[PDB]
């Protein structure tokens, strides 16, 4: 319009460069937007962010930017650009340019039955990249399809790093992680035992959850809250070995753990009887009750099953790891919006340096 250009009666200044708006969804603090790129000469996707009336929105915000902005990698969601007032007091909303991507893996897997080409190539690259979110001591925590963007010549991303945080092993995090993350059905078993004690293996557990998704269509642990899901879990891996239990440090929990009936465990074949070997064996050492023994992703590439792919020269780390100076950010939302009015002043018309 002739000042702000509005979008379901909301206003989406995204200045001149950004035109012919169209309603894309919802995130977490606003909606999404596809918009004319007048530079660029391509759509793009557009996120409009309004954390600044709560704490942990604002947290999150920075979060996610102070990582993307740093992370460059191929299978990974970058940040092109990031529209904001020209002064704090002006600057309510942010707005978070990113690449448009045709589809995602939650929405493929609505309609398509994935052949094991294009299964072991997605796994492939959500591992190659998430490789690098390792290597820079960073926890995704909410890998699934939905998180998985696609576009239109296979090439995989992941996004959403709004629920993503640092965690430098140099420090002791055991009881000061955030208690409930990721989605439920991606859930690994130690965040509902040891609840705030949790490592980076829970991505890899929330991969193996895609990988059964990418070969049947359908979750593989469906559960309807943080017990069934529990339940959901163990009737398929059955019940936990004795050197299991004693690794759950929470005496509750490894109680009630313990005061569950049998369960066998569901062969894997039975459940994928379509399925390729490897697959299923990698599958097997992705969804590994015990965070321990599980494969880690520098061993999941090097599996069989990516043999093909497989390629250590050309699949990359983060130069510079993010440390304990990225976990201070526990801060007042004044605080926050003054770091996240700093990290996009680069973005700024005209911005030097």
Not at 12 to 24: C, H
Not at 132 to 149: C, E, F, M, Q, T
Not at 310 to 338: G, H, R, T
Request: net charge neutral; with cysteine.
């Amino acid at each position: 319009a002739a000042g702000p250009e509005m979008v379901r009666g909301q206003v989406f200044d995204v200045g001149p460069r950004y035109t012919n708006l169209s309603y894309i969804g919802e995130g977490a603090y606003g909606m999404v937007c596809s918009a004319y790129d007048n530079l660029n000469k391509v759509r793009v996707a557009i996120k409009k962010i309004s954390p600044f009336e709560h704490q942990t929105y604002c947290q999150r915000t920075l979060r996610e930017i102070k990582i993307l902005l740093r992370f460059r990698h191929e299978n990974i969601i970058g940040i092109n650009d990031i529209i904001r007032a020209p002064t704090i007091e002006q600057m309510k909303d942010v707005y978070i340019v990113q690449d448009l991507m045709e589809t995602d893996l939650y929405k493929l897997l609505k309609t398509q039955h994935l052949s094991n080409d294009h299964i072991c190539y997605f796994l492939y690259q959500i591992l190659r990249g998430l490789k690098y979110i390792h290597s820079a001591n960073v926890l995704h925590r909410d890998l699934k399809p939905s998180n998985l963007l696609l576009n239109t010549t296979c090439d995989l991303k992941i996004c959403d790093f709004g629920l993503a945080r640092v965690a430098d092993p140099d420090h002791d995090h055991t009881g000061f992680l955030t208690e409930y993350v990721a989605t439920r059905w991606y859930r690994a078993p130690e965040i509902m035992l040891n609840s705030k004690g949790y490592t980076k293996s829970i991505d890899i557990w929330s991969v193996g959850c895609i990988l059964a998704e990418m070969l049947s269509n359908r979750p593989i642990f469906p559960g309807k809250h943080y017990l069934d899901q529990l339940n959901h879990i163990l009737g398929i891996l059955g019940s936990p070995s004795q050197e299991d239990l004693n690794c759950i440090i929470n005496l509750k929990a490894r109680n009630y753990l313990l005061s569950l009936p049998h369960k066998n465990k569901v062969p894997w074949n039975r459940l994928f009887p379509n399925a390729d070997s490897k697959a299923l064996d990698l599958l097997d050492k992705m969804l590994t009750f015990n965070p321990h023994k599980r494969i880690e992703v520098e061993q999941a590439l090097a599996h069989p099953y990516l043999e093909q792919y497989y390629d250590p020269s050309d699949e990359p780390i983060a130069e510079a790891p993010f440390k304990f100076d990225m976990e201070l950010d526990d801060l007042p939302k004044e605080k926050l919006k003054e770091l996240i009015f700093e990290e996009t002043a680069r973005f700024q018309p005209g911005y030097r340096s």
